[PDB]
């Protein structure tokens, strides 16, 4: 059943809302948004698949991209309370897709500076994943009121968290 | 769009109540869009919506497999799945009369099989791959061996 | 035996090739057991065997949902499952014409609906709860709109 | 999540082989065992569902039953190395079925002593499940494939262990 949820998560990332800065006037339509009118200098919210289409046409530019400075800041804050399970940094459901976009553009450049930022970002990501996963597993066993912490998880981390809590509950019910 | 239904299905353990009006709402938008949405945007968008519709089906059928009780516009689809299950159990527990690859079935409604007219109460011995669709359509009911 | 089929289905990642010859052999064993098995043991054993056959269906259908390709005696059952999914996707992507809960369908074989005779090529508007079983039985196909 | 496979595992345990000491002669048949002829004073191996039927008829007695002393011993050994993930007590495949049968007989008797002994057994099993889940999840997070440890897991625990291993590898390998 995990494979079904993996495909559903991957397909949901295409429709995440992205804050975009309009650089050129453009009026168009889609099934999701209907007819919309974009004006220069105004920030608007668009589905991710449509924001990428309008970016490739030099119509607008995506604003909330992740950077290596953001990855270093997240790793720093995660290291501040490594033994605190409830100290997860709020990332958001679109964090994983934005990271994959930042890493894909680094591979597309093929520059020496881009490949260096690619290796450093992968190293920072590995440390972030280690720290957050350990806090996540401990959080699943703590049985604490988790509503702001769930909002701060990525989509993939939320799947791991709820799968652990469901597996524990199902094993308890099957034995008891 | 369909992403709303997929997200809610992914978060809740039980099967969400998706009323038929919700489905009509999204179908109406897909239909109206053909007059003012460009073909380039609409083709890529329909690909994403089709995949989301697959996921919604897969997520809800996964919950049906686990034993959750489904309610909503697609309940008639889940009932067909239960017919496949019951046919599977009855077959493997020896409740059907099998002759080679064929199965004994009792006719329920007037039926034309192999250019031959049969009526209710008649008995027909036909392959399983042909019998099961006719069982789902209520034209046939498998002859069930009474235990003891 | 059923326990062997369930045990191998749990240990294998792909769908095991359960040929029809093995199913017919086990059904023959069940019928032959009626000669020697008492009614008390046979009744209690029916619960545990039907539960194993139920699990075998669930395990194999779960692998179909995850993406595994199904091969074996029950391939005609998985094909019906694919029809349910394709109907689900076509419906949510606006490829059908729906009026409330009814759907436009093209008649494939001579059919009797509401005590009226319809012939091949005719168009019938009928509830989805009644159309889908007739689609699986090849009596109807849904009228398709090309939204591409 | 794994509800289908958990039911399949439980239904398989009803056919597992159980040691039985025959106390009364009885000859019969089933679909699983075929024609069988039992004799007094001879230990035989029968499926669990058939052994329970013959035990209720006083035809034979089941020998390898779990007790409350066995649960307390498993909990004690589990607390000795509570922070060590690779110190799971080897339980086996039939532990879960024998525990389910132990709680089934206590709830069937409906005696007062069966109630207080049930509560004490639930408290022991809850401590055993929590500690073993701590170690098992950590083994999956550490990604350590030790053949000796995997054998010590029950079928249900092994499923949980592999599900989380595969989930981490797929999410953070893609």
Residue numbers in the entry:
A (entry chain C): 1 to 176
B (entry chain B), C (entry chain A): 1 to 148
D (entry chain D): 1 to 174
Paper excerpt:
The structure adopts a tetrameric architecture, with two copies of GINS51 and two copies of GINS23 in an approximately twofold-symmetric complex. Each subunit has two subdomains, with a larger α-helical subdomain (A) and a smaller subdomain that contains β-strands (B), consistent with the structures of other archaeal and eukaryotic GINS protein structures. The order of the A and B subdomains is reversed between the two subunits, with the A subdomain first in SsoGINS51 and the B subdomain first in SsoGINS23. In the archaeal structures, the core consists of both complete GINS23 subunits and the two GINS51A sub­domains. The underlying subdomain structure of GINS51B, Sld5B and Psf1B is conserved, but its placement relative to the GINS tetramer core varies among the structures. In the case of SsoGINS, the two GINS51B subdomains have a unique and sizable dimeric interaction surface. We therefore conclude that the dimeric interface of the SsoGINS51B subdomains of the crystal structure is not compatible with the simultaneous adoption of an interaction with polymerase as identified for TkGINS. Hence, the SsoGINS–RecJ interaction of the AlphaFold-Multimer model is consistent with the interactions observed in both archaea and eukaryotes and would not sterically clash with the conformation of the SsoGINS crystal structure. Although it is not known whether an SsoCMG structure would closely match eukaryotic CMG structures, this analysis shows that the 51B subdomain would need to move a large distance from its crystal structure position to accommodate a eukaryote-like CMG structure.
Eukaryotes and archaea partly achieve this regulation by strictly controlling the activation of hexameric minichromosome maintenance (MCM) helicase rings that unwind DNA during its replication. In eukaryotes, MCM activation critically relies on the sequential recruitment of the essential factors Cdc45 and a tetrameric GINS complex at the onset of the S-phase to generate a larger CMG complex. Archaea also use a six-membered MCM ring to unwind DNA, and archaea possess GINS and Cdc45 homologs that stimulate the activities of MCM in biochemical DNA-unwinding assays. We present the crystal structure of the tetrameric GINS complex from the archaeal organism Saccharolobus solfataricus (Sso) to reveal a core structure that is highly similar to the previously determined GINS core structures of other eukaryotes and archaea.
